[PDB]
């Protein structure tokens, strides 16, 4: 029921770009940490998350490689992509059916077009809240974790059904980047 309503909204986001503002509330340090940036998404497997302030970071996935770039360290970690929706909330936003979500999460619908996902077996994530605007646009994500951290990500300047070329999601390292390639066999 609730899972089906959520996926109907997600499956209809074929591509998207947006700005984001992130506030991270850390209970173990009692620090409130702010950041901002932009994101791009394209079904079925493309995701890009760029932090522009205060740090420079990029997470990019093309369905084959996951690139984790820290601009302040000039360091790149490369991993293989798994459809690990329990670990990566943004993979929920690429979903097209309810099969794996229902096996890994209990999903509840609430008023004002929001949904709460609670893992059935997970220690890291306590809950994921996905909120849509009345006209079914992505509005914010809230992620609560057993590290006692609460992350709220709010989207603005949302644009959908842009035509992003697939090469936009193939990361090209800057010159002299420190590489940790974890895909080598």
Give burial (CB, 10 Å; 0-12/13-18/19+) of 16: buried
List the structure tokens of 22: 């992130």
- Rg of the chain's alpha carbons, rounded to an integer? 16
CB 154 within 8 A of CB 34: no
CB 45 within 8 A of CB 61: yes
Asked whether the CA dihedral 2, 15, 19, 126 is positive or negative, the reply is positive
| Domain ranges, ordered by start, for the chain | 2-181
What resolution (Å)?
1.8
H/E run at residue 104: helix 99-104
Give burial (CB, 10 Å; 0-12/13-18/19+) of 51: buried
Please tell me the distance from the alpha carbon of residue 131 to that of residue 94, in angstroms, as a whole number.
Answer: 16
Asked whether the CA dihedral 65, 69, 150, 38 is positive or negative, the reply is negative
Length of the chain: 185
CATH class of 2-181: mainly beta
Method: X-ray
- Strand 178-181 and strand 75-80: the pairing is parallel
Please tell me the distance from the alpha carbon of residue 71 to that of residue 13, in angstroms, as a whole number.
Answer: 29
For the chain, give percent helix, strand, coil, nearest 5.
15, 50, 35
Q: Could you tell me which residues come within 8 angstroms of residue 175 by beta carbon, excluding any fewer than 6 positions away?
A: none
Alpha carbon distances (Å) from 37 to 2, 58, 156: 30, 9, 10
CB 101 within 8 A of CB 117: yes
Give burial (CB, 10 Å; 0-12/13-18/19+) of 115: buried
Closest CA to 89 of 41, 135, 136, 54: 41
């Amino acid at each position: 029921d609730a899972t089906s309503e959520l996926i109907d909204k997600i499956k209809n986001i074929h591509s998207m770009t947006a700005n984001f503002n992130q506030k991270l509330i850390d209970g173990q340090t009692n620090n409130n940490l702010n950041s901002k940036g932009n994101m791009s998404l394209k079904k079925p497997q493309y995701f890009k998350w760029i932090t522009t302030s205060p740090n420079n970071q990029e997470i990019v996935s093309n369905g084959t490689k996951l690139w984790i770039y820290d601009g302040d360290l000039d360091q790149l970690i490369i991993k293989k992509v798994s459809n690990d929706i329990a670990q990566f909330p943004y993979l929920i936003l690429l979903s097209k059916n309810t099969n794996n979500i229902n096996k890994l999460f209990t999903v509840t619908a609430q008023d004002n077009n929001s949904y709460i996902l609670k893992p059935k077996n997970d220690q890291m994530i306590d809950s994921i809240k996905i909120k849509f605007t009345p006209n079914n646009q992505l509005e914010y994500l809230e992620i609560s974790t057993s590290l006692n951290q609460f992350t709220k990500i709010e989207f603005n300047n949302v644009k959908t059904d842009v035509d992003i070329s697939n090469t936009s999601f193939d990361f090209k390292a800057p010159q002299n980047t420190d590489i940790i390639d974890e895909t080598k066999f």
